[PDB]
Amino acid sequence: FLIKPYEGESLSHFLGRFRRANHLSASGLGTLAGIGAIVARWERFHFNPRPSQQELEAIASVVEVDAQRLAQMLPPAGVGMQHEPIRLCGACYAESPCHRIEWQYKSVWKCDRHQLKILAKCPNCQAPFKMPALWEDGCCHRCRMPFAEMAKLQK
Amino acid sequence: FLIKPYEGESLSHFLGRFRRANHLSASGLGTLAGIGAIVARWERFHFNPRPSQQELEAIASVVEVDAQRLAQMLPPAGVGMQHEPIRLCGACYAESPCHRIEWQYKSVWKCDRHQLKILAKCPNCQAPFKMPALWEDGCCHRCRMPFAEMAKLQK
Amino acid sequence: DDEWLQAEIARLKGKSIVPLQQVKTLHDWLDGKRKARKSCRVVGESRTGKTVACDAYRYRHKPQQEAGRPPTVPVVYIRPHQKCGPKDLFKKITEYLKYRVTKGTVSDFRDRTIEVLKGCGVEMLIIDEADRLKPETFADVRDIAEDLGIAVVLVGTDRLDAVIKRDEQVLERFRAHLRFGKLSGEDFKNTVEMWEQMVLKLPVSSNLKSKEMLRILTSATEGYIGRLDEILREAAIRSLSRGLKKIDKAVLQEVAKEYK
Amino acid sequence: DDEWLQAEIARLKGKSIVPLQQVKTLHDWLDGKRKARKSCRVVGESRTGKTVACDAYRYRHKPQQEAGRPPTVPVVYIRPHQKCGPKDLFKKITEYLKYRVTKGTVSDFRDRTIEVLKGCGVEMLIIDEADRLKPETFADVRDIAEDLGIAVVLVGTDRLDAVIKRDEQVLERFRAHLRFGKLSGEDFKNTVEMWEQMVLKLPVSSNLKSKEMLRILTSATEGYIGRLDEILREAAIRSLSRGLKKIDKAVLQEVAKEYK
Numbered sequence: 001f002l003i004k005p006y007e008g009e010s011l012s013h014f015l016g017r018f019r020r021a022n023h024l025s026a027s028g029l030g031t032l033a034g035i036g037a038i039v040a041r042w043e044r045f046h047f048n049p050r051p052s053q054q055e056l057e058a059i060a061s062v063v064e065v066d067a068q069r070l071a072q073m074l075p076p077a078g079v080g081m082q083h084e085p086i087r088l089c090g091a092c093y094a095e096s097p098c099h100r101i102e103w104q105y106k107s108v109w110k111c112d113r114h115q116l117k118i119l120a121k122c123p124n125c126q127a128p129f130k131m132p133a134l135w136e137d138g139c140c141h142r143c144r145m146p147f148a149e150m151a152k153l154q155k
Numbered sequence: 156f157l158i159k160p161y162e163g164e165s166l167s168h169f170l171g172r173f174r175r176a177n178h179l180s181a182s183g184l185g186t187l188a189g190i191g192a193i194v195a196r197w198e199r200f201h202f203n204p205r206p207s208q209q210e211l212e213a214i215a216s217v218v219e220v221d222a223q224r225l226a227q228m229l230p231p232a233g234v235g236m237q238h239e240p241i242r243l244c245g246a247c248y249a250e251s252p253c254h255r256i257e258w259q260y261k262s263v264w265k266c267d268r269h270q271l272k273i274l275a276k277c278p279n280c281q282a283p284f285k286m287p288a289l290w291e292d293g294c295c296h297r298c299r300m301p302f303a304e305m306a307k308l309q310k
Numbered sequence: 311d312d313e314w315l316q317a318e319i320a321r322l323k324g325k326s327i328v329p330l331q332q333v334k335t336l337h338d339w340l341d342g343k344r345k346a347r348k349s350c351r352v353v354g355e356s357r358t359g360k361t362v363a364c365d366a367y368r369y370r371h372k373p374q375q376e377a378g379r380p381p382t383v384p385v386v387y388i389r390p391h392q393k394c395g396p397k398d399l400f401k402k403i404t405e406y407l408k409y410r411v412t413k414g415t416v417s418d419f420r421d422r423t424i425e426v427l428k429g430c431g432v433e434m435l436i437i438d439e440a441d442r443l444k445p446e447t448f449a450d451v452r453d454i455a456e457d458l459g460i461a462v463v464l465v466g467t468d469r470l471d472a473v474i475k476r477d478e479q480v481l482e483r484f485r486a487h488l489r490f491g492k493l494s495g496e497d498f499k500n501t502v503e504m505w506e507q508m509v510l511k512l513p514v515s516s517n518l519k520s521k522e523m524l525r526i527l528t529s530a531t532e533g534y535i536g537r538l539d540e541i542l543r544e545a546a547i548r549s550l551s552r553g554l555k556k557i558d559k560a561v562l563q564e565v566a567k568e569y570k
Numbered sequence: 571d572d573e574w575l576q577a578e579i580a581r582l583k584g585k586s587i588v589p590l591q592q593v594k595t596l597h598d599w600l601d602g603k604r605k606a607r608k609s610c611r612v613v614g615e616s617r618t619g620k621t622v623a624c625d626a627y628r629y630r631h632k633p634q635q636e637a638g639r640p641p642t643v644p645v646v647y648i649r650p651h652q653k654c655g656p657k658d659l660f661k662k663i664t665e666y667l668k669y670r671v672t673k674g675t676v677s678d679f680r681d682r683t684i685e686v687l688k689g690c691g692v693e694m695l696i697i698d699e700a701d702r703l704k705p706e707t708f709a710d711v712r713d714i715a716e717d718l719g720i721a722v723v724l725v726g727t728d729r730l731d732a733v734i735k736r737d738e739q740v741l742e743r744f745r746a747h748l749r750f751g752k753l754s755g756e757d758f759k760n761t762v763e764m765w766e767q768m769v770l771k772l773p774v775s776s777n778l779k780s781k782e783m784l785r786i787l788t789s790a791t792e793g794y795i796g797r798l799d800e801i802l803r804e805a806a807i808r809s810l811s812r813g814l815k816k817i818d819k820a821v822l823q824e825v826a827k828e829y830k
């Protein structure tokens with residue numbers, strides 16, 4: 001089962017969404033692509049050894065999304081990002097149910113489209129968000145508030 | 156019952172082979188050596204906390220193989236390895252019935268001696284190999300193909 | 311006419327909810343327990359109609375959501391699967407409230423479920439098939455009913471009573487019950503006629519549920535609402551498949567002997 | 571001629587499916603239960619021919635796949651192994667639909683199986699040898715039939731009835747049955763003659779299933795279709811191995827005494 005990426009979707013979110021569509025573990029996707037543990041590293045936003053051309057093309061062969069498009073699920077060259085905290089604009093999620101790579105940019109604190117501060121934890125119960133690959137439903141894993149409803153609590 | 160290591164034998168494979176010669180569980184070998192659960196960790200190639208001098212000497216006292224020789228059952232300093240997938244050269248196994256630590260080196264994909272791709276699962280039935288400590292016989296645990304015969308299916 | 315026949319068979323395949331005195335007593339009792347946050351346990355036979363009545367009590371209070379706040383769900387209905395662990399149960403609680411889970415430990419799921427459970431102002435926790443979940447989860451449901459003040463109704467067959475009996479606290483805390491009746495009597499005849507009028511939805515051929523039909527259906531269903539529904543639907547579909555406009559005696563005899 | 575002899579022995583070793591009234595009644599009943607999503611349980615003796623008939627009902631609705639959408643499988647046939655757990659059963663369900671499993675917990679397998687089961691639009695869940703699976707899995711099959719609206723047919727020997735009887739819900743929910751007959755009578759003689767014409771596929775030597783042959787086969791098979799098949803195939807192979815063109819009396823006597 002193939003999936004079309006959402007605009008701005010992060011690599012972690014896309015990988016997990018592909019895995020859920022195919023009932024794959026991270027190790028299973030890694031074996032399908034021939035790169036093993038690299039998949040789980042990318043899902044946790046750990047790229048000490050940045051994604052190589054061969055690794056991106058290996059994943060591209062499985063998910064049928066070109067390496068160039070996969071690179072747009074990561075920050076451009078020179079744009080610093082953070083693996084933690086995982087962040088969210090609930091108003092964005094209501095429009096398109098994905099985590100955006102921009103929300104991990106170190107320079108980003110406000111959603112430009114919605115002119116709201118982005119969230120660094122659930123505004124109802126304060127639970128931090130899991131890595132985007134594990135965003136199985138669109139709700140806080142603790143209190144079960146929908147990400148779309150968190151828009152109403154954004155400042 | 157003491158056993159001489161095979162050249163290049165991995166620590167996991169050697170530990171399991173010693174245990175089989177003495178009808179020991181991993182916990183039993185750990186208690187004999189005074190280090191408990193560490194034995195099973197090493198058998199699954201888990202060394203986030205690397206083997207200490209005291210731990211290697213504790214095992215050395217039981218198996219009567221010097222800590223220096225036990226260290227040659229692990230990669231040298233600076234050589235990265237993987238706990239997964241467990242890999243195999245069947246042509247090597249036909250010559251010497253052990254798992255080699257080199258087959259877990261991240262940089263290794265071909266056997267230099269035999270100029271064959273090494274195997275990451277049974278080439279007959281695709282079953283992954285167990286941790287080397289559990290290689291009780293020289294055959295695939297699923298289809299029962301001998302590891303030595305898998306040489307004929309290596310590419 | 312063939313399109314009409316397909317519509318008829320599709321409608322007969324689909325089940326409906328006829329409101330009768332059994333479900334009326336049930337949601338009256340449920341409202342009484344809800345107004346006091348009294349945790350009870352409705353018990354009954356199998357294939358008798360408890361799940362449908364609890365479902366009706368669930369839909370009647372359809373949650374009304376505010377413009378920008380979580381929807382307030384007064385009644386929560388769950389049917390945990392076989393050997394449902396605590397993590398699975400918490401997942402189900404927070405999933406019904408439309409809060410997708412986040413990967414984590416059992417403590418994380420418990421905390422998120424508690425947060426979303428107080429957030430939506432829930433009044434009822436209806437655990438149907440409450441004989442499936444493990445006894446390491448009854449402590450969790452006990453804690454929910456103890457601290458969050460939510461009246462929990464444990465629904466299930468009579469085996470649920472045996473399951474809770476071997477435990478100590480869950481038996482004492484959940485002691486109020488409402489056994490589902492057999493329905494046999496003149497009320498049973500009223501049920502047959504009311505079913506004929508509503509669920510069958512066939513042209514009036516003056517079947518009227520005569521004495522012979524009542525005897526056949528009494529011998530067949532043994533008082534079960536589910537058996538009555540199955541037999542009626544099977545007879546209607548068999549009559550409509552063979553071209554018969556109404557339901558004859560031969561089809562009831564066939565379905566009755568096929569059952570017993 | 572030796573190549574012809576090898577072809578004959580290979581064909582005789584392989585079993586076929588002669589369509590007779592038993593399987594005709596069976597798939598008629600199965601179609602009736604399928605059009606209404608009615609979950610029943612076909613029961614019968616051992617070595618009588620239920621598995622082959624369910625197999626025929628499986629192949630007749632060979633799934634027709636769209637160009638780019640999952641193949642729609644109306645009938646699902648499973649034969650779970652001894653002491654089949656819930657994970658094993660779910661693995662089998664999603665494997666028949668040609669969805670290879672992914673490593674995970676029992677909940678993951680359940681979710682994937684439910685997803686692929688609604689995706690392919692399945693109408694039937696035929697669980698042959700339904701006396702093998704554990705009773706912690708009958709709750710799962712109950713949930714499948716309850717929520718996904720799939721008519722489940724539990725197939726197995728009479729021991730399956732005893733297995734389900736000790737349970738509460740599975741007995742009430744799965745009550746419609748179709749016992750397989752013994753076939754003894756003139757229909758049995760018709761079966762012998764029809765088998766001689768089709769399955770034996772030997773040159774016409776006017777055996778005609780005479781009275782003596784009928785008596786021998788009645789004493790041998792005791793009404794079983796499987797015993798009839800085994801005895802006929804053994805006699806044919808023994809006659810062809812010793813050079814006999816047709817099947818003599820001595821070979822039936824030998825195979826009959828070898829059985830009893």
Ligand SMILES: Nc1ncnc2c1ncn2[C@@H]1O[C@H](COP(=O)(O)OP(=O)(O)OP(=O)(O)O)[C@@H](O)[C@H]1O
Nearest residue numbers: 325326327328356357358359360361362535536539
């Ligand atoms: N109020 C009702 N209106 C219409 N049909 C009903 C009603 N109550 C029960 N039924 C019928 O009962 C059958 C199933 O009932 P239900 O699932 O509620 O059983 P239950 O008492 O909870 O038992 P079990 O625990 O054995 O599942 C269905 O055929 C359904 O149509």
Ligand SMILES: Nc1ncnc2c1ncn2[C@@H]1O[C@H](COP(=O)(O)OP(=O)(O)OP(=O)(O)O)[C@@H](O)[C@H]1O
Nearest residue numbers: 585586587588616617618619620621622795796799
């Ligand atoms: N319609 C049929 N056409 C041809 N052979 C049949 C038919 N039905 C049954 N048989 C024969 O019956 C034997 C096995 O029958 P089957 O496997 O269906 O049994 P069953 O009734 O399901 O019993 P069991 O549970 O004991 O396996 C085989 O020899 C097979 O050839």
Ligand SMILES: [Mg+2]
Nearest residue numbers: 357360361439
């Ligand atoms: Mg019920």
Ligand SMILES: [Mg+2]
Nearest residue numbers: 617620621699
């Ligand atoms: Mg069988």
Ligand SMILES: [Zn+2]
Nearest residue numbers: 089092111114
């Ligand atoms: Zn936004």
Ligand SMILES: [Zn+2]
Nearest residue numbers: 244247266269
């Ligand atoms: Zn080699």
